[PDB]
Design an enzyme around this catalytic site. Sequence first.
Site, PDB file in Angstrom:
ATOM      1  N   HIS A   1       2.081   9.099   0.744  1.00  0.00           N
ATOM      2  CA  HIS A   1       1.019   8.870  -0.233  1.00  0.00           C
ATOM      3  C   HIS A   1       1.321   9.775  -1.421  1.00  0.00           C
ATOM      4  CE1 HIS A   1      -1.455   6.898   2.921  1.00  0.00           C
ATOM      5  NE2 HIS A   1      -0.746   7.707   3.675  1.00  0.00           N
TER       6      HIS A   1
ATOM      7  N   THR B   1      -5.740   6.891   7.861  1.00  0.00           N
ATOM      8  CA  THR B   1      -6.330   7.098   6.538  1.00  0.00           C
ATOM      9  C   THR B   1      -6.378   5.828   5.702  1.00  0.00           C
ATOM     10  OG1 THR B   1      -4.277   7.632   5.440  1.00  0.00           O
ATOM     11  CG2 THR B   1      -5.425   9.450   6.542  1.00  0.00           C
TER      12      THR B   1
ATOM     13  N   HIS C   1       0.801  -1.223   0.000  1.00  0.00           N
ATOM     14  CA  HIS C   1       0.000   0.000   0.000  1.00  0.00           C
ATOM     15  C   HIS C   1       0.831   1.270   0.000  1.00  0.00           C
ATOM     16  CE1 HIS C   1      -3.270  -2.727   0.985  1.00  0.00           C
ATOM     17  NE2 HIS C   1      -2.623  -3.107   2.072  1.00  0.00           N
TER      18      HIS C   1
ATOM     19  N   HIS D   1       5.962   7.114   6.119  1.00  0.00           N
ATOM     20  CA  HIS D   1       5.642   6.684   4.766  1.00  0.00           C
ATOM     21  C   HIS D   1       5.028   7.869   4.041  1.00  0.00           C
ATOM     22  CE1 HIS D   1       1.961   6.320   7.123  1.00  0.00           C
ATOM     23  NE2 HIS D   1       1.397   6.703   5.999  1.00  0.00           N
TER      24      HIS D   1
ATOM     25  N   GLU E   1      -3.338  13.538   0.780  1.00  0.00           N
ATOM     26  CA  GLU E   1      -4.560  13.085   1.438  1.00  0.00           C
ATOM     27  C   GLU E   1      -5.300  14.281   2.028  1.00  0.00           C
ATOM     28  OE1 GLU E   1      -3.411   9.513   3.885  1.00  0.00           O
ATOM     29  OE2 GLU E   1      -4.434   8.678   2.128  1.00  0.00           O
TER      30      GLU E   1
END
Length: 257
Positions: A93, A195, A61, A91, A103
């Site tokens: 996104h 999230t 992911h 990490h 996000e």
Amino acid sequence: HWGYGKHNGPEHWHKDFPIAKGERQSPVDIDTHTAKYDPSLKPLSVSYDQATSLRILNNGHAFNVEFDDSQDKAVLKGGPLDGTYRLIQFHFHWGSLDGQGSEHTVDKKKYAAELHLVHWNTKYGDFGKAVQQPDGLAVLGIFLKVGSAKPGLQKVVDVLDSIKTKGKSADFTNFDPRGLLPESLDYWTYPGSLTTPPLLECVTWIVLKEPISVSSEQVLKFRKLNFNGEGEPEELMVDNWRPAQPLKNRQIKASFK
Ligand SMILES: COCCNC(=O)c1ccc(S(N)(=O)=O)cc1
Ligand SMILES: COCCNC(=O)c1ccc(S(N)(=O)=O)cc1
Ligand SMILES: [Zn+2]
């Protein structure tokens, strides 16, 4: 299982994680005009000088840089937080194009990516117990825009070739996460959630106002990763972001006037 595609993406998550429709879900749009300066916030303290990175992992992911959290080596305190929160991983996104990937959004603006530094409240003894608590976690969120390269990101970029596919990990010691921070610690804060599934409502979000700049080549390297495991049909790891969720009964506070 859950993912970011048409058939297992954010609009499906509620079927197995009904808290997806809960009262304090994340991310949210940060409407800067309705956020309110909060003089009761204490100075924010990011204390990463003793941070001990261990490993980088592609979990299908995103990719996580994990830290030794067996002592108070890299902690976050102050701001809206009571007590001490210990860094466990970071990490990102990111998007398939520079115009999306974050996000949180700021007055509906999407950034190219978003960094999450994940911390747990030491009063709960470890991460697993912390995610059973309404104040168990604090996530420091940092926007990425495409422009000049970020020198302190390059060591991450350079290792991604070794963790292309889900389940791959590599040694990642002696990485200093201070190289990922912008100059200013001005921030917005609100109570929210993870999230990604399981979407637990344990997080005090602290989202920095100032983005960091990364180069086009750096983010393109993120986009070469795979959601799939080795030997599986290739699906590029892109657009691993959840869209903004209803603010509901929440007020976003600002640390700055
Ligand atoms: C395993 O092969 C694919 C069959 N499963 C699915 O399509 C699926 C879709 C959504 C969820 S979710 N987002 O509610 O958790 C879980 C599973
Ligand atoms: C109990 O959860 C199982 C593992 N998941 C996590 O540790 C986790 C941590 C942070 C985020 S995020 N994107 O909100 O920062 C999302 C997930
Ligand atoms: Zn995240």
